[PDB]
């Protein structure tokens, strides 16, 4: 099943950056459900 160490953590960063993404209108799918936060809701 799914490895758990080759998985690119949403945080393992690269030295310097060189080695859509934002929701247009503020108030108004991949944006609505934040993982880390789904936690506080439960």
């Amino acid at each position: 099943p799914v490895d758990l160490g080759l998985l690119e953590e949403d945080d393992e960063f690269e030295e310097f950056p060189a080695e859509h993404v934002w929701e247009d209108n503020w108030d108004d799918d991949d944006f609505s459900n934040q993982l880390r936060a789904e936690l506080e809701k439960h």
């Binding site: 099943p1 799914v2 490895d3 758990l4 160490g5 080759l6 998985l7 690119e8 953590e9 949403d10 945080d11 393992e12 960063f13 030295e15 950056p17 060189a18 859509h20 993404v21 934002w22 929701e23 247009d24 209108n25 503020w26 108030d27 799918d29 991949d30 944006f31 459900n33 934040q34 993982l35 880390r36 936060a37 789904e38 936690l39 506080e40 809701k41 439960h42």
Partner: protein
């Protein structure tokens, strides 16, 4: 469980290696993780690792089956530094019957602390004793932070993402693992996280950044995955956090933020309270659920549409627009008392001179004494812009201290990415609810191309109104401005100011132009005239429609702008045709003006 007997029997044995090994230079051995990742082994994206699927446990999903673990669930960003695993729930009775405890991968020993708990402390030591680990370069807090983060992450993982994850992450081994990971990075090779890298005035400050909100009302906490500072929020962000449209654990991405507090070479996270990360609404926004905290690949400002934007929410790092209409200059005076005075050119020439004549009167008198102070006026250029592809309330962008050539650079009907513009409220009888685009020293402009057809969709060049339309109540044109051509039939200019000028077209339709300024002159009846930028207005002379003449207004008796001619020389026709026009005109006015059947 076990017995306190065979406990200090590795605790007081542990400290041994601490000392004895700290009495030398160690052998830094890369941990598990670090090496794995470093390998040639194919890697996975949470994205893919979940099948382009995003979180489905909305306030408790009914299927705890998968692997519950009420020993995590009750974890939240705040209680992640606490925690402590229960050496009894995740084990059984295995290597716990002896006097060793638990050796959790990579090497090193964890001392399943007394009461049956293993948390913060333990692992710190259980780290110090781990191969290649030199507890001489670390603290029990530095590991209090990293503990926290990691935990939190994991916890989640299970939650929202179970059909792929479970208690496969809450394994102090797994845990102690990254814990080690961190070491090999932040230390071994010394690659500083975003924050840590910036809170150390070492890498370009708050430019692009994706962070996750860690804590909460005065202000809130943001983390890059490694450390967390407190952000300084502006009015509308507040109004979000307040409304709950932004909650801990959500990821945002900001732009050109700024570092308030300690303008000194600040130590890695763990400083005062004076520092803060100031982030402005119009510079930050919601990020996609994965997104990878830290800095960000392309730093070059992300464009937004005007459609959003708050008056109160700082500069728009950038907008891509089309310049609907460009305008005539302006001169502005800060009267000693504060007040501002807008002036047309051939209108701040008059006053311009008025001063001169009196300035003059001053010296005349200064020396009729020795012998026998200035004006705060500045220039401004305003133009009407719109977010590129789409519909919006148009925006009024104003460049102060304009510039010789620039008049001929930003034009009407062209496309521009304007980088760095301050945003403010509208305040202008003529546009009340909207926002203001104001260029700064920072600002810069880019002209991008546009397709003839994408053009004709967004834009709307200028065109000389038909007259007819003005009677109709269905004429709700753009923001209310219009341009026109007609011949002057009469100039009523009563003292109790605000002159009117009636013009008529070739079909004898009239309109009056209430003047908010002084009559450009040349404005005698029988004259061909071309007004530009007239405001619209309800009505006036019982019957005939009105148009107001602005500081931004324009008139000419000899127009060059092409959009007029089709109606100008169209007008020239009746004009030149006869004279009995300049006369049919009166008839009408007088007629209109006096009504169908007055006391004849």
């Amino acid at each position: 469980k076990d017995l306190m007997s065979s406990l200090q029997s590795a605790r007081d044995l542990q400290d041994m290696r601490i000392k004895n090994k700290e009495r030398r230079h160690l052998r830094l051995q890369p941990g598990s993780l670090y090496l794995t990742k470093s390998s040639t082994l194919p890697r996975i994206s949470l994205q893919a690792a979940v099948g382009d699927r995003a979180p489905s446990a909305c306030s408790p999903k009914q299927l705890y089956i998968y692997g519950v673990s009420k020993e995590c669930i009750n974890v939240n960003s705040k209680n992640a530094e606490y925690f402590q695993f229960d050496i009894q729930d995740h084990f059984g009775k295995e290597d716990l019957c002896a006097g060793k405890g638990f050796q959790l991968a990579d090497g090193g020993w964890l001392i399943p602390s007394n009461d049956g708990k293993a948390g913060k402390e333990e692992f710190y030591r259980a780290l110090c004793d781990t191969p290649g680990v030199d507890p001489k370069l670390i603290s029990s807090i530095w590991v209090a932070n990293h503990y926290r983060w990691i935990v939190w992450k994991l916890a989640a993982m299970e939650f929202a993402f179970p059909k792929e994850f479970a208690n496969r992450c809450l394994n102090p081994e797994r845990v102690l693992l990254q814990l080690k990971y961190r070491y090999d990075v932040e230390i071994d090779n010394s690659r500083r996280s975003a924050l840590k890298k910036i809170l150390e005035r070492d890498d370009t400050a708050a430019k692009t950044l994706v962070l996750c909100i860690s804590d909460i009302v005065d202000t809130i906490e943001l983390t890059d995955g490694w450390y967390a500072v407190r952000a300084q929020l502006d009015p509308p962000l507040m109004a979000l956090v307040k409304s709950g449209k932004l909650t801990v654990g959500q990821k945002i991405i900001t732009q050109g933020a700024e570092l308030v507090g300690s303008p000194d070479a600040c130590a890695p996270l763990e400083a005062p309270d004076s520092l803060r990360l100031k982030i402005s609404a119009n510079s930050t926004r919601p990020a996609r659920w994965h997104s990878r905290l830290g800095f960000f690949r392309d730093p070059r400002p992300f464009p937004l549409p005007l459609s959003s934007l708050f008056s109160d929410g700082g500069n728009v790092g950038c907008v891509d627009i089309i310049v609907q209409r460009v305008y005539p200059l302006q001169w502005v005076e800060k009267t000693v008392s504060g007040l501002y005075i807008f002036r047309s050119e051939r209108e701040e020439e008059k006053e311009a001179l008025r001063f001169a004549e009196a300035q003059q009167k001053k010296l005349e008198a200064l020396f009729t004494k020795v012998h026998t102070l200035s004006r705060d006026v500045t220039t401004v250029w305003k133009l009407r812009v719109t977010s590129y592809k789409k519909k919006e309330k148009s925006a009024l962008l104003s460049i102060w201290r304009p510039s010789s050539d620039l008049s001929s650079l930003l034009t009407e009907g062209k496309r521009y990415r304007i980088y760095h513009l301050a945003v403010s409220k509208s305040k202008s009888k003529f546009e009340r609810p909207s926002i203001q685009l104001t260029a700064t020293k920072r600002t810069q402009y880019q002209q991008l191309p546009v397709s003839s057809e994408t053009l004709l969709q967004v834009y709307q060049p200028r065109e000389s109104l038909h007259f007819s339309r003005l009677s109709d109540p269905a004429f709700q044109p753009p923001c209310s401005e219009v341009d026109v051509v007609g011949v002057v039939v009469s100039v009523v200019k009563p003292i109790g100011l605000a002159p009117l000028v009636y013009l008529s077209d070739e079909c004898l339709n009239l309109l009056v132009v209430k003047f908010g300024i002084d009559l450009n002159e040349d404005i005698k009846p029988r004259v061909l005239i071309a007004a530009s930028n007239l405001q619209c207005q309800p009505e006036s002379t019982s019957g005939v429609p009105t148009l107001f003449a602005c500081h931004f207004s324009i008139f000419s008796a000899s127009p060059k702008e092409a959009y007029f001619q089709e109606k100008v020389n169209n007008l020239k026709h009746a004009i030149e045709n006869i004279d009995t026009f300049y006369k049919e005109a009166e008839k009408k006015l007088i007629h209109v003006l006096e009504g169908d059947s007055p006391k004849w």
